[PDB]
Design a protein around this ligand. Structure first.
Ligand SMILES: *[C@@H]1O[C@H](CO)[C@@H](O[C@@H]2O[C@H](CO)[C@@H](O[C@@H]3O[C@H](CO[C@H]4O[C@H](CO)[C@@H](O)[C@H](O[C@H]5O[C@H](CO)[C@@H](O)[C@H](O)[C@@H]5O[C@H]5O[C@H](CO)[C@@H](O)[C@H](O)[C@@H]5O)[C@@H]4O)[C@@H](O)[C@H](O[C@H]4O[C@H](CO)[C@@H](O)[C@H](O)[C@@H]4O[C@H]4O[C@H](CO)[C@@H](O)[C@H](O)[C@@H]4O)[C@@H]3O)[C@H](O)[C@H]2NC(C)=O)[C@H](O)[C@H]1NC(C)=O
Ligand SMILES: Cc1nc2cc(OCc3n[nH]c(=O)n3C)c(C3CC3)cc2s1
Ligand SMILES: [Ca+2]
Ligand SMILES: [Cl-]
Ligand SMILES: [K+]
Ligand code: NA
Ligand SMILES: [Zn+2]
Length: 806
């Protein structure tokens, strides 16, 4: 109960919320049904509209008006935003030439440039170019400030997950807002767009920017505006707050627009009805900038213009129906639409089997427009699994499509023409970023980047220490004129051993054989040098990776490759090699077909063994450095060492072999040499982080050889591809992947065909950031380059998406 009998007089849009049954006058009261009786009258004034006119100039103040055109309004801070334009001969901000803002130009009493975050719902990245003629305020922000061609949202590309990632720097799996709809089985409670449960604080994890600021003594305006407060009032309230005394004035502010998303759902991303919403958004930005200019704040405030996600063409007829695949359709609950999440309708049903649901949904129609996954098999780049609110079964839906449970759900619940929610690499889901102000750069374009990075930057802009988050702090330093964050490289925790020859062949009883006893001071001194690391400068281009946890490992040198070999996991953590443009591919000779050779630098006790593989009828093996790319017939013997071997399902070897035999040489051709680092990943609890030894759920039968959940590779070359990978003077170019190590190829519906028809498509789906691989391995790459550390942090956050041009 709210006894709504108090007054909002002198209290309108109060920053500090009061505890009911005291009524409330803050911009959330409407959402809680708790406003005082006079809230509309006093706080939502609309009399005379939003703009000064020639006849209103110099008027006698009338407190009933929405905004004012009287002489006293500027000091009072409540003029209509076009006041000085209409009455004092001033130009609109959009009509002024832009001029570099080298330093903040702020009124006395400002301790730091304020930050204003203007967020737009459903603002697709291509609107900046395509709508440019009708958005001149936005175009000026964009061209005069710092801008990216687009900003990558998080998955799912829905509103709440993305706005909360913007606020926290966290993946949805960590912040807890994993969709627009959710069931939490621990609370046994549901979260929905409509309703009140979404306001309960138990949904919202991490630490959002407004709490980070408050806790560190920086005051914050509101971020969540009640839908019924018009845009013009939100702007005037921000302008009013900026006129408060120094000790009361917030330093951070947010404005939110429900558009263009609201219209885009009805008309599609490029419907002719979309012009007007973009015009209206531009006019609101114009009102803010004119307002800031009136207050002499337009060269003081940092402004961010940012979207949550884009918008795609989606109509009712493009719906797949689970009732077409499942007979048991009423025994499941589907969270539907641009993604699917399935769980049992009833937990008392012991006949419910996710395995048989997956099988009934796998590759059943020729052009099937969704693909089923256990959540732990989703591409690791989506970071969408480590939350009890994410159902074990997930459906990834093709762009332009919907999934629903039954046809009745679609015509009993065509209206819409746009929607979003799809895979976050999809071009139509991409959104916008512009920063404009003293702290951003002038007329600068920066590469595309992920929205998880912005929290850190907003903290930098406000001089705040960010809470622990998934951004990589420093990776966006190139956006900023000053206030950069200067990170140091993490300290290596374990130093390596460098073993020499310490074991005789006969000490190994591994059940391994090799036709290798087919036997000179030229090339015996030579092979000794190679084993001591004579070629290491060629294969380890950026220094050895640092191991950031306590463990026992050895560096192993060879003619063609270098590895860091784990005595705990019995295989390399990483294997590094360079393949020049001119390198040649050879085959595994017949005499070496099943050859595995003991490594005399490494004890039998710390070695894999061939008998385990023989005995394990499911598990085979592959090699991290490919025998196909050996530099000479003699060097090829190194690739068959037991220390270069890793466990692989036969289904996975089809993938791995095509990558190693065909694709590495192809990339070396296209890129002028590549350096490759490959290795295993163990993530049995799907939390995106390196497993400890006691977390491993599967071993090669009868042995202590742990089975990787994934295999990675990081492929680096010179950004200027006129220089070879091993002789690069400037910036680097990277692409990486984290391939799931699966015992079938059910994921790929075309896998009965030749690897050339399906493997590359699989790898593209499992594209990754070096940073993703770091989390997953506890390794730190690129320790020794001639490049700045911030540039390397940007490189580590890069994602090769394989999409066409935006
Ligand atoms: C992205 O960035 C984020 C932020 O850096 C990373 O997430 C962090 O990962 C850490 C490692 O997993 C994790 O550290 C653990 O924290 C536990 C205490 O956590 C509470 O307090 C913090 C701090 O205020 C708070 O943020 C947490 O909030 C979580 O939980 C609430 C719900 O209760 C949610 O509202 C919120 O959204 C968030 O949930 C998310 O994280 C949890 C895991 O914490 C997941 O379960 C959820 O799915 C969701 O993703 C908490 O309120 C602490 O207890 C842990 O300590 C145990 O494990 C360590 C290992 O070192 C061990 O030493 C300890 O002894 C202890 O073990 C004992 O307890 C075990 C478990 O009960 C038990 O099995 C053992 O037997 C032992 O007795 C641990 O230190 C940190 O909480 C999260 N933070 C956040 C915000 O998510 C994330 O890794 C990054 N992602 C990537 C890919 O890099
Ligand atoms: C820059 C940022 N803007 C916002 C804006 C936000 O909310 C904006 C908002 N106001 N009214 C409404 O319906 N929405 C969605 C939120 C809340 C959803 C959490 C976080 C952030 S972080
Ligand atoms: Ca893990
Ligand atoms: Cl959802
Ligand atoms: K086997
Ligand atoms: Na298949
Ligand atoms: Zn929407």
């Amino acid at each position: 109960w709210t006894a709504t009998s108090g007054s909002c007089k002198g209290r309108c849009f109060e920053l500090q919320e009061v505890g009911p049954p005291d009524c409330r006058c803050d911009n959330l009261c409407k959402s809680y049904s708790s406003c005082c009786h006079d809230f509309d009258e006093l706080c939502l004034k609309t009399a005379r509209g939003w703009e000064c006119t020639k006849d209103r100039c110099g008027e006698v103040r009338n407190e009933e008006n929405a905004c004012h055109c009287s002489e006293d309004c500027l000091s009072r801070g409540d003029c209509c935003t076009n006041y000085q334009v209409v009455c004092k001969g001033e130009s609109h901000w959009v009509d002024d030439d832009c001029e570099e803002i080298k330093v903040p130009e702020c009124p006395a009493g400002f301790v730091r440039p304020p930050l204003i975050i203007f967020s737009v719902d459903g603002f697709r990245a291509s609107y900046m170019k395509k709508g440019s003629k009708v958005m001149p305020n936005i175009e000026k922000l964009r061209s005069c400030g710092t801008h990216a061609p687009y900003m990558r949202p998080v998955y799912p590309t829905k509103t709440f997950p993305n706005l909360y990632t913007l606020a926290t720097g966290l993946y949805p799996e960590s912040h807890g807002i994993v969709g627009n709809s959710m069931y939490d089985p621990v609370f046994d409670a549901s979260f929905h767009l409509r309703g009140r449960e979404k306001f309960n604080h138990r949904w919202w994890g991490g630490q959002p920017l407004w709490i980070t600021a408050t806790k560190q003594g920086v005051r914050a305006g509101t971020f969540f505006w009640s839908v019924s407060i018009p845009h013009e009032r939100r702007i005037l309230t921000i302008l009013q707050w900026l006129s408060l005394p120094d000790n009361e004035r917030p330093s951070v502010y947010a404005f939110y627009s429900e558009q263009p998303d609201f219209s885009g759902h009805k008309y599609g991303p490029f419907g002719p009805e979309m012009t007007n919403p973009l015009r209206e958004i531009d006019k609101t930005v114009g009102q803010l900038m004119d307002g800031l200019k009136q207050l002499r704040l337009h060269r003081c405030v940092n402004v961010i213009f940012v979207g949550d996600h884009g918008m795609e063409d989606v109509t009712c007829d493009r719906t797949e129906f689970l009732s077409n695949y499942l007979t048991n359709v009423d025994d499941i609950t589907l969270v539907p639409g641009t993604l699917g999440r399935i769980r049992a309708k009833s937990i008392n049903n012991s006949k419910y089997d996710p395995k048989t649901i997956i099988a009934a949904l796998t590759c059943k129609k020729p052009d099937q427009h969704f693909k089923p996954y256990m959540k732990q098999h989703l591409p690791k780049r989506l970071h969408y699994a480590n939350n009890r609110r994410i159902e074990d079964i997930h459906l990834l839906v093709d762009r332009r499509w919907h999934v629903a449970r039954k046809p009745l759900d679609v015509y009993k619940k065509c209206f819409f023409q746009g929607d979003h929610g799809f895979d976050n690499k999809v071009n139509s889901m991409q959104t916008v970023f512009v920063g404009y102000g003293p702290t951003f750069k002038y007329r600068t374009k920066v590469p595309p980047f992920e929205n998880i990075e912005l929290y850190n930057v907003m903290c930098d802009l406000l001089g705040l220490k960010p809470a622990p988050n998934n951004g990589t702090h420093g990776s966006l330093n190139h956006l900023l004129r000053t206030n950069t964050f200067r990170p140091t490289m993490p300290d290596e925790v374990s130093r390596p051993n460098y073993p020499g020859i310490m074991y005789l062949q006969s000490e190994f009883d591994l059940g391994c054989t090799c036709d290798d006893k087919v036997e000179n001071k030229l090339e015996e001194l030579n092979k000794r040098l190679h084993t001591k690391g004579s070629t290491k400068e060629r294969h380890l281009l950026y220094g050895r990776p640092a191991v950031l946890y306590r463990t026992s490992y050895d560096i192993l040198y060879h003619t063609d490759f270098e590895s860091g070999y784990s005595e705990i996991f019995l295989m390399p953590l990483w294997t590094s090699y360079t393949i020049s443009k001119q390198a040649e591919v050879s085959s595994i000779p017949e005499h070496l077909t099943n050859c595995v050779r003991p490594d005399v630098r490494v004890s039998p006790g710390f070695s894999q063994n061939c008998l385990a593989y023989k005995n394990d009828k499911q598990m085979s093996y592959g090699f991290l450095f490919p025998p196909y790319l050996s530099s000479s017939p003699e060097a090829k013997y190194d690739a068959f060492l037991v220390t270069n071997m890793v466990p692989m399902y036969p289904a996975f070897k089809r993938v791995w072999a095509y990558f190693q035999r065909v694709l590495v040489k192809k990339y070396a051709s296209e890129r002028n040499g590549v350096n490759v680092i490959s290795g295993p990943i163990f993530d049995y609890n799907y939390d995106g982080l390196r497993d400890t030894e006691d977390e491993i759920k599967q071993y090669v039968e009868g042995s202590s050889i742990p089975v990787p959940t994934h295999y990675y590779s990081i492929i680096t070359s010179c950004l200027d591809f006129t220089q070879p990978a091993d002789k690069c003077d400037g910036p680097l170019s990277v692409s990486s992947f984290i391939l799931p190590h699966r015992p079938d190829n059910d994921e790929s519906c075309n896998s009965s065909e030749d690897e050339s028809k399906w493997v590359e498509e699989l790898m593209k789906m499992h594209t990754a950031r070096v940073r993703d691989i770091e989390h997953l391995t506890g390794l730190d790459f690129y320790r020794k380059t001639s490049r700045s550390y911030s540039e390397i942090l940007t490189l580590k956050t890069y994602l090769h998406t394989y999409e066409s041009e935006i």
